[PDB]
Design a protein around this ligand. Sequence first.
Ligand SMILES: O=C(NC[C@]1(O)CCCN(c2cc(NCc3ccccc3)ncn2)C1)c1ccc(CN2CC3(CCCC3)C2)cc1
Lengths: 198, 241
Amino acid sequence: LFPPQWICCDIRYLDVSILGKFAVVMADPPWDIYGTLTDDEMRRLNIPVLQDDGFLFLWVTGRAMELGRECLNLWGYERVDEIIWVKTNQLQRIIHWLNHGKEHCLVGVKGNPQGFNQGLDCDVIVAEVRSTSHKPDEIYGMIERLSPGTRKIELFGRPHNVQPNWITLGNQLDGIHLLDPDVVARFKQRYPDGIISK
Amino acid sequence: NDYCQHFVDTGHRPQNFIRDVRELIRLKDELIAKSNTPPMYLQADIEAFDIRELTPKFDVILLEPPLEEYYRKCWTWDDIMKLEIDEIAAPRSFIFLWCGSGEGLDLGRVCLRKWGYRRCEDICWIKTNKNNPLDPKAVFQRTKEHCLMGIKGTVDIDLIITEEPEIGNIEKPVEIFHIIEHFCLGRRRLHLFGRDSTIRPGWLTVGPTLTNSNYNAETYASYFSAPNSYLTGCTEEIERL
Ligand SMILES: O=C(NC[C@]1(O)CCCN(c2cc(NCc3ccccc3)ncn2)C1)c1ccc(CN2CC3(CCCC3)C2)cc1
């Protein structure tokens, strides 16, 4: 259901099978490279239930460039693209062994997606850095043009990340805001007291 | 302003709008040039060549296999992964591997681990299309190539921005040599799958399309014999006579 939805939760402990299937998944995990997840916690995230045919967008840095590829493969995705965001100031100038001018987002595919608009955007984002750890808003427009009007889910998002067509999960969101009746119904069955533990 | 939307509207890549594409990093340039060995180069078909003939062991290896994707004799990741790179790398050494933009981003990582390196940097060659505003698995238009940096044993940004070369031009940006040489990693520098056009002081270039060779293993080794065995390439010559 078009307007933004979100669940404040521990993504480790949420039963994501109540959310249904999504055309696009995006994750910006707190890699252990504060609230981080161990490598084993990342591997055991129930990403496989979230999609049948579609795309995963997975932000990586440092050794999560490798560990993210591992998770991507374990969850049943093939990595088919890699977006980089070149970080500029407001005058379009670029901000261990080398200084870092960019962030990486792996793009994985699962199954055989049909009816996506592949090739509309290119794999380089040039955009102004804002708050720390804040992804560029351009990615949502890219994803919308790639898969217009479909259901999407973001993992480890923050309040500024909520978007129409997206359900946002993170432990710094404000409560639970669900409007999709399919989801509302499955959430009430699974969580009749509204609590998400264990 | 959203340059992704703009690219969709006009065909101008977002990287076209990046501006500006110390001062003593020039004296360092000069020290590199002074300690550089004479350029050395060897025509060799690397698939048939016994890599161990290339001595001594190298401090840095630049590996630029001609991938199929570079063309609208090509090497597959199958062939590349079977190179015995670890047999010629020094116990402390570095590798720079051009991986393209597709499956190489994963298979090049496999190669690095296979040869005993861990990846320490991901250097992105971002190609602008200012002069001129397709793989089935691609989700997006691919406008960059990656050169992965690997370390084994115990000033610059990780981006190179140039215009997309003419179709059929496989050359990589010469800027990569600048990044490598500015690290001051040692003087035994090998470029596998280099060409006549890439031969360079400070480097031993080996490749199947070289038209001429001057490589002599004993001559080459004599550039690093004492007192010069451990220089970084970023320090003054060592006085003699
Ligand atoms: O701030 C973040 N994201 C919201 C949370 O809410 C915060 C708090 C933990 N986090 C969780 C964690 C969790 N479960 C495990 C747990 C819970 C409590 C204690 C320990 C462990 N469940 C839900 N959210 C996410 C965040 C910060 C940096 C990065 C790194 N990227 C790189 C870029 C920069 C450019 C774009 C990509 C940012 C990614 C996300």
